[PDB]
């Protein structure tokens, strides 16, 4: 049972995710979406029955060999993972699972903020810049940090995108000092580059 | 009828994987299958088992060696043990409520658990250091200010974050968690409010580390 492992598609635009297996029309299909860190949802079962609650905007079909989800007007948040499963009057399979992905979503620059070191966790021995990053799109940042107009080329860890629940995505950046380092330059710029234009964010010891 | 899953945690290597999975809104001895499913990282669904209320049993062959789960009616709720456990056993285990095939309708599975993340490691839990966000002219745009909360060094995941103890909810944003080399996990919480009640409103962020059975609620001050 397999279906293909991405799919992508405009927003408004109607996408198919297929599911394939040897005389599959001789069995009936269920249909899950699962969003990220979500439990999956029963959205199509017996090939073509939407369990109540379930909009008419999915629907499903099976013949042959193929089972299909299709969702017509698919806005941002039907992006998921969708799994089939497939029924025999003895057994069930899960299929692979499909990632659905939304393509032409307009043009959204990031929202940059930075916080320096608590005054508790310096007292704690520790300093942590946190860059945080959110609201943009497409989901791809570049981030460097630089002290006193210097590159920092250690101590930093930087999340990948991940999507928010308005469609746009976030990360965040983390830099590590000693409070002796935090104490010995003037300034900290955390620097957010999306789409060849940057956002900087300043900290400063002296506040 | 709803399946509420009990908290993520650590096991150890060659341990076992002991949840349960406690059913409300309907009977246990309802016709269904009870059933376990889990998803390692980024992979996909795996059916691991399922019992009925009689206490018949059906288990992946794969996992059989392994694998023991049963029902408790008194407590209305099934439960999953899963033994001499590798780092590959590492998933977010799922309990599910299993429609009986149907001639007509088929099978299905639903509703299922919210999923409870299950990590096979060597090292300790250790429950998350937090620390204030402190909202300024630095984090204000106009009408709005951003602050929050560092969860810093803890194992393994899952951290959740919520604000005021949940009455305050929109403009939460809390942020996916960096894994540093040291092998502890940190993450941040920000909620965006008023700038002009800054003096005014109290502020606190609830973290909750399930895997230490610890939550930290943190006062955060301008």
């Known amino acids: 049972l397999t279906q293909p492992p991405s799919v992508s598609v405009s927003p408004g635009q109607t996408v198919n995710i297929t599911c394939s297996g040897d005389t599959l029309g001789d069995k009936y299909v269920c249909w899950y979406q699962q969003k990220p860190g979500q439990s999956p949802v029963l959205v199509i079962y017996?090939?073509?029955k939407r369990p109540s609650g379930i909009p008419e905007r999915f629907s499903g079909s099976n013949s042959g060999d193929t089972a299909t989800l299709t969702v017509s007007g698919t806005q941002a948040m039907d992006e998921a993972d969708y799994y089939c499963?497939?029924?025999?009057?003895?057994?069930?399979?899960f299929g692979t699972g499909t990632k659905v992905t939304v393509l032409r979503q307009p043009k959204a620059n990031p929202t940059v903020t930075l916080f320096p070191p608590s005054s508790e966790e310096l007292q704690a021995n520790k300093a942590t810049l946190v860059c945080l990053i959110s609201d943009f799109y497409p989901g791809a940042v570049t981030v460097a940090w630089k002290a006193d107009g210097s590159p920092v080329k250690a101590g930093v860890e930087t999340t990948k995108p991940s999507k928010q629940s308005n469609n746009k995505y976030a990360a965040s950046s983390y830099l590590s000092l000693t409070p002796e380092q935090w104490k010995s330059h003037r300034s900290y710029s955390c620097q957010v580059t999306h789409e060849g234009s940057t956002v900087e964010k300043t900290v400063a010891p002296t506040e | 009828v709803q399946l509420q899953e009990s908290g993520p945690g650590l096991v150890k290597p060659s341990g076992t994987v002991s949840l349960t999975c406690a059913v409300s809104?309907?009977?246990?001895?309802?016709?269904?299958?009870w059933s376990w499913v889990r998803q390692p990282p980024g992979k996909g669904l795996e059916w691991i088992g399922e019992?009925?209320?009689?206490?018949?049993?059906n288990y992946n062959p794969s996992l059989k060696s392994r694998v023991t789960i049963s029902v408790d009616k008194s407590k209305n709720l099934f439960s999953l043990k899963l033994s001499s456990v590798t780092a590959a056993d590492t998933a977010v285990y799922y309990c599910?409520?299993?429609?009986?095939?149907?001639?007509?309708?088929?099978?299905?599975?639903?509703?299922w658990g919210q999923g409870t993340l299950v990590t096979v490691s060597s090292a300790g839990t250790k429950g998350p250091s937090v620390f204030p966000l402190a909202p300024s002219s630095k984090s204000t745009s106009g009408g709005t200010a951003a602050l929050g909360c560092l969860v810093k060094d803890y194992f393994p995941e899952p951290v959740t974050v919520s604000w005021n103890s949940g009455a305050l909810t929109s403009g939460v944003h809390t942020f996916p968690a960096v894994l540093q080399s040291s092998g502890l996990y940190s993450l941040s919480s920000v909620v965006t409010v008023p700038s002009s009640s800054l003096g005014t409103q109290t502020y606190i962020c609830n973290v909750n580390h399930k895997p230490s059975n610890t939550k930290v609620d943190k006062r955060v001050e301008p």
């Open positions: 809104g309907g009977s246990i001895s309802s016709s269904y299958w």
């Open positions: 499963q497939a029924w025999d009057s003895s057994s069930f399979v």
């Open positions: 017996q090939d073509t």
């Open positions: 599910a409520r299993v429609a009986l095939f149907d001639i007509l309708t088929g099978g299905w599975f639903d509703p």
């Open positions: 019992i009925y209320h009689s206490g018949n049993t």
